[PDB]
Design an enzyme around this catalytic site. Structure first.
Site, short mmCIF file in Angstrom:
data_model
loop_
_atom_site.label_atom_id
_atom_site.label_comp_id
_atom_site.label_asym_id
_atom_site.label_seq_id
_atom_site.Cartn_x
_atom_site.Cartn_y
_atom_site.Cartn_z
N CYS A 180 0.15 -3.92 -2.84
CA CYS A 180 -1.39 -2.99 -4.28
C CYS A 180 -1.16 -2.22 -4.72
CB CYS A 180 -2.23 -3.33 -2.47
SG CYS A 180 -3.88 -2.46 -2.57
N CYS B 216 -3.40 0.16 -3.93
CA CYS B 216 -2.74 1.05 -2.39
C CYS B 216 -2.25 2.37 -2.48
CB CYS B 216 -2.27 0.21 -1.71
SG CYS B 216 -3.50 -0.57 -0.78
#
Ligand SMILES: [Ca+2]
Ligand SMILES: [Zn+2]
Length: 110
Positions: A38, A41
């Site tokens: 991600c 993230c």
């Protein structure tokens, strides 16, 4: 003028969050549910680290693929999702990489 007694912990397998919650009964716990793949993230992770230096809370990182049962239990469907847990119970969440909203959430429940 001061430093906070801070904690930033990355968990490893299902059961570790429940153990952590029991170990830290009277702290606000702020959990970053993230994924390895991600982008958002990875971008927010250093900001989450910085935040952990500012508040007397337990800051936790949970990889949704390493703690699958815990992600399922918290109904994670997008990443990053930040969950605030007070006295063992969910009191709020922020879905998406918004460090301002995460901090607002901490301010509210700490
Ligand atoms: Ca710093
Ligand atoms: Zn601890």
């Amino acid at each position: 003028q001061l430093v906070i007694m801070s904690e930033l912990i990355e968990l490893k397998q299902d059961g570790d969050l429940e153990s952590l919650l029991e170990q830290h009964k009277n702290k606000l716990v702020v959990v970053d549910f993230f994924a390895t793949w991600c982008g958002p993230c990875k971008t927010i992770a250093p900001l989450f680290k910085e935040l952990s230096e500012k508040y007397d809370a337990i800051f936790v990182k949970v990889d949704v693929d390493k703690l699958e049962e815990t992600a399922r239990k918290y109904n994670i469907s997008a990443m990053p999702t930040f969950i605030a847990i007070k006295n063992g119970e969910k009191v709020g969440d922020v879905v998406g990489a918004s460090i301002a909203k995460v901090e607002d959430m901490i301010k509210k429940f700490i």
